[PDB]
């Protein structure tokens, strides 16, 4: 049976801290953002705002917007398909790598980065957290929560206003002028 939480009328994440739980494949809290489906299995409420756990999956596509996080560190661990990760270090040097399932990428705070899914229905396991809390409700805030299972039929394109206001609540800084010179 399911739970009612702060985030969903129907969720498999228990609302109270301190409760163990299991969630079958795909049934975490879901959000749509562009063509991608984000699925949250644990958030800050579960971990005293220490860490989170979520997956991101999507169609073969182009790079997501280049961005950074001032106080948040991010893991990319590939589970399906192939994902090209772009990252610029603090010294301005850029790096790219095609990550295949079981490969790992790590993006520290203040490092500009982006990714491109290079196979249909690629999937990434992510953790996104830091001294300033956990990041997981970003996705449904800029994008939209989803009740349906599976990849969105139509991409969810946030209205411009969302891109201005979501940084006020979530640790994200967009870098639309950023150019990748790794090819």
Site residues for a second copy per CB under 8 A: 17-26, 28, 41-42, 46-48, 50-51, 53, 73, 75, 77, 79, 85, 87-90, 95, 97, 99-111, 113, 125, 127, 129-131
Distance CA 163, CA 147 (A): 23
Q: Show the CA angle centred on residue 51, arms to residues 4 and 44, nearest 5°.
A: 30
Distance CA 131, CA 121 (A): 32
66 closest CA partner among 80, 79, 85: 85
Taking contact as CB under 5 A, which single stretch among the options 33-41, 67-75, 82-90, 119-127 is the one that binds Ni ion? 67-75
Q: What is the closest distance, in whole angstroms, from the C-beta atom of residue 55 to ligand QUE in the complex?
A: 8
Q: What is the closest distance, in whole angstroms, from the C-beta atom of residue 77 to a second copy in the complex?
A: 7
Distance CA 74, CA 39 (A): 16
Of 80 and 165, CB closest to a second copy: 80
Q: What is the closest distance, in whole angstroms, from the C-beta atom of residue 53 to a second copy in the complex?
A: 5
């Amino acid at each position: 049976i399911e739970y009612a939480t702060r985030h969903r009328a129907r969720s498999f994440i228990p609302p109270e801290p301190g409760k163990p739980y299991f969630i079958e494949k795909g049934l975490g809290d879901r959000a749509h953002l562009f063509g991608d489906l984000i699925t949250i299995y644990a958030g800050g409420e579960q971990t005293e705002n220490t860490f989170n756990f979520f997956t991101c999956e999507g169609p073969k596509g182009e790079v997501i917007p280049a961005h950074s996080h001032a106080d948040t560190y991010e893991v990319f661990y590939i589970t399906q398909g192939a994902v090209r990760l772009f990252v610029e270090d603090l010294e301005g040097e850029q790096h790219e790598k095609l990550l295949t399932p079981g490969d790992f990428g790590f993006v520290p705070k203040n490092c500009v980065h982006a990714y491109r899914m290079e196979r249909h229905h690629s999937q990434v396991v992510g953790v996104a957290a830091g001294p300033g809390g956990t990041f997981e409700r970003f996705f449904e805030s800029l994008g939209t929560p989803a009740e349906e299972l599976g990849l969105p039929v139509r991409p969810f394109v946030p209205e411009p206003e969302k891109f201005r206001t979501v940084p006020e609540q979530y640790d994200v800084r967009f870098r639309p002028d950023h150019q990748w010179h790794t090819g």
